[PDB]
């Protein structure tokens, strides 16, 4: 029965509950995604502002939606779970009725729509969450990277970041990503991702997690040791010359 | 605290419900209307103000009938009055469908009573902006009731409400004393015309049309009927000469 209208217009034409939702994202940990010639990589920061953290069981920040699409986020973690469950269900249902997995665009469009609905219905507040969604379409090798935000707006990106200090890592990439010559290796593309996080995390692979999505549902998370190589080796280049 | 008057089901600290009190103002502010019990029937009358010459005379009828034997008239917010009658008509139909007999007037008063009182119970609704005068002829004779926005109602010998209510009340008090034996229906009709003309003098500024109806055992047969043609004329005459 509770249908109080919480997302409404104020006189300047703004919707404060939605704008306040973006504030939750800005407080969330940085996430970033960049696309190669044929990988997409998703990287996110951890808080080591606490370190008795059981890292094997604690929820990862990157989530599989189907075997070929992943989703990461910044903002309220509890809220993220609900978008992810809805998406996973939509992906399985889409297979059932159309006999094909979802396109990344479709899945993005779906999630954005959910987000939007929550800015226009009584009794609910918007999601305190912004998302990056990545993967390859079925029988297709051109990589996809999409972004959604609490208002429900979505769009695709050569590369992009969200969360605390996103505007710093956006700078970095705004000038280090060549659209004419995107990262041709996985290794290369993973490197550009770690580089951009290192502007903001400033500890190391303790605090970074990476996940690499490749065509035909080939998805894999890196372990801190192999991430470390990317960190330790970023040092030798900045200093010596 | 303050603002005991903003919400409708709320008691102020002196024990009162200010929104009902404010609804009474909407009524005090309406046009004049009255009821007179004669000794086998009842008579209703009401001042219809004439805004403009563009109104069609005869044709904006403010007295409403319920079932076949009950008349209602009301001062205040007119659409609320109509809403209340629509309810009254459902109530009388339900009662009659089940019990066969047309609804007894007291029974019918309490039906409106309960429904009106009901709109003083909750803040999500607003009290009725009318006082309603009504009645008719049941198997125990004539009954006249009046019903306030609070759901208070009682039986009357006569009753009035709207702007003119005090000149009318004084005038009715006369009739009661100067006719203790009872008043015949046809005389009560003429008196009603007089009383409306007398109560109109609060705002002579506006011209007005008169409307009267009656439910009488001998004269209309216990059914409710409007007064019109010759009998209406004759009662308007009696009202003119009683002014000079």
């Amino acid at each position: 029965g509770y249908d109080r209208a919480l997302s409404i217009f104020s006189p300047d034409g703004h919707i404060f509950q939605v704008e306040y939702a973006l504030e939750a994202v800005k407080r969330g940990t940085c996430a970033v995604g960049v696309k190669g010639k044929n990988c997409v990589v998703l990287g996110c920061e951890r808080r080591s502002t606490l370190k008795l953290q059981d890292t094997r069981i604690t929820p990862s920040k990157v989530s599989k939606i189907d075997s070929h699409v992943v989703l990461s986020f910044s903002g309220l973690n509890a809220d993220s779970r609900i978008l992810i469950e809805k998406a996973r269900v939509e992906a399985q249902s889409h297979r059932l009725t159309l006999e094909d997995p979802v396109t990344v665009e479709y899945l993005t469009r779906y999630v954005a729509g959910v987000q939007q609905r929550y800015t226009q219905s009584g009794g609910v507040r918007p999601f305190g969450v912004s998302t990056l969604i990545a993967g390859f379409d079925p029988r297709d090798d051109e990589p996809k990277l999409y972004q959604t935000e609490p208002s429900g707006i979505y769009s695709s990106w050569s590369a992009q970041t969200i969360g605390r200090n996103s505007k710093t890592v956006r700078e970095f990439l705004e000038k280090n990503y060549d659209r004419k010559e995107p990262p041709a290796t996985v290794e290369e593309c993973v490197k550009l991702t770690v580089r951009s996080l290192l502007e903001v995390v400033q500890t190391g692979a303790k605090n970074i997690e990476i996940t690499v999505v490749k065509p035909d549902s080939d998805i894999v998370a890196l372990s801190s040791e192999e991430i470390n190589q990317y960190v330790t080796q970023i040092e030798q280049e900045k200093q010596e010359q | 605290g303050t603002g005991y008057d903003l919400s409708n089901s709320v008691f102020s600290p002196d024990g009162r419900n200010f929104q009902v009190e404010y609804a009474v103002k909407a009524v005090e502010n309406g046009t004049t209307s009255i009821g007179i019990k004669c000794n086998d029937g009842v008579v209703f009358a009401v001042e219809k103000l004439i805004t403009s010459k563009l109104l069609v005379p005869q044709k904006n009828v403010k007295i409403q009938v319920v079932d076949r034997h009950i008349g209602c008239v009301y001062s205040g917010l007119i659409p609320d009055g109509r809403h209340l009658v629509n309810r009254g008509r459902e109530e009388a139909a339900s009662f009659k469908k089940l019990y066969k007999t047309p609804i007894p007037i007291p029974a019918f008063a309490d039906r409106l009573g309960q429904y009106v009182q009901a709109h003083t119970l909750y803040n999500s609704v607003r009290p009725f902006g009318v006082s309603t005068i009504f009645g008719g002829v049941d198997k125990n004779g004539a009954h006249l009731y009046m019903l306030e926005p609070s759901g208070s109602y009682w039986g009357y010998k006569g009753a009035a409400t709207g702007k003119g209510r005090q000149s009318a009340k004084a005038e009715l008090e006369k009739l009661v004393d100067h006719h203790p034996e009872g008043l015949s229906a046809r005389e009560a009709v003429k008196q009603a015309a007089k009383i409306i003309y007398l109560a109109h003098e609060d705002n002579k500024e506006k011209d007005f049309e008169l409307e009267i109806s009656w439910c009488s055992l001998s004269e209309t047969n216990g059914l409710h009927k409007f007064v019109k043609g010759d009998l209406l004329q004759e009662a308007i005459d009696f009202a003119q000469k009683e002014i000079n």
Partner: protein
């Protein structure tokens, strides 16, 4: 209407926080501290009761430690009554999983649903969040011994050791300094109590003001045992840590 009385429990502050969650967390900060520590061969749960009279019946009391299942338990900090609602729906979630799949429910799965529940109170329906934080200790065979925490926002996280309620900044620091991974269970027992000795706002730490529990695959057989210590067992363990 009644939207005047609605303090809107599901909205964001201009910083993007949820007022009522933050406030519930504030509430929780004044609750008895609770602690969970995971060893490679078991788990410890320890908690401080709210200063309890001498006349209170400590045998039958169960203010902070609760069995969800033969393999999962929780330590509560916050409103007992709110928690027992949640505990009970969780005991049922476990039973449903067990009945559908004929397999005991994995710890995370349970934790996630219960956290999803709290999250809902935070996004729709205008009710107040549950003023509870939870430490969950459990064993399953996909991840062995596990320790998790959840709070009113709906967020959950996993830990090797953790505290909730009073003085968690302090208590977190002290564990951070003394925890090691090879840690055995009787080491954890000792560490859990050291920490509350330092942490308590009460000047001593005595048996009658504690609740205590362990989850051991110990000893001989691969099965798992849950032990909630009685008053006498806790007194013994306190002597044996020379904290008394």
């Amino acid at each position: 209407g009644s939207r005047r009385y609605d303090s809107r429990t599901t909205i964001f502050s201009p910083e993007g926080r949820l007022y009522q969650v933050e406030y519930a967390l504030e509430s929780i900060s004044h609750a008895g501290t609770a602690i969970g520590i995971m060893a490679s061969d078991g788990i410890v749960l320890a908690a401080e009761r709210k200063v309890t009279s001498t006349l209170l019946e400590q045998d039958t009391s169960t203010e902070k430690l609760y069995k969800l299942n033969d393999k999962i338990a929780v330590a509560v900090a916050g409103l007992t009554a709110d928690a027992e609602i949640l505990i009970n729906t969780a005991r049922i979630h476990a039973q449903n999983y067990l009945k559908t799949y004929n397999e005991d429910i994995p710890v995370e799965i349970l934790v996630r649903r219960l956290s999803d529940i709290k999250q809902g109170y935070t996004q729709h329906g205008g009710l107040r969040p549950f003023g509870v934080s939870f430490i969950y200790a459990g064993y399953d065979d996909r991840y062995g011994y596990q320790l998790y925490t959840s709070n009113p926002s709906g967020n959950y996280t996993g830990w090797k050791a953790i505290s909730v309620g009073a003085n968690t900044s302090a208590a977190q620091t002290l564990l951070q300094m003394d925890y090691k991974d090879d840690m055995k269970v009787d080491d954890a027992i000792e560490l859990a109590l050291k920490t509350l000795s330092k942490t308590t706002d009460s000047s001593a730490l005595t048996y009658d003001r504690l609740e205590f529990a362990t989850i051991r695959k110990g000893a001989n057989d691969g099965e798992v045992y849950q032990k909630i210590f009685k008053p006498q067992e806790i007194k013994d363990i306190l002597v044996k840590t020379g904290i008394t």
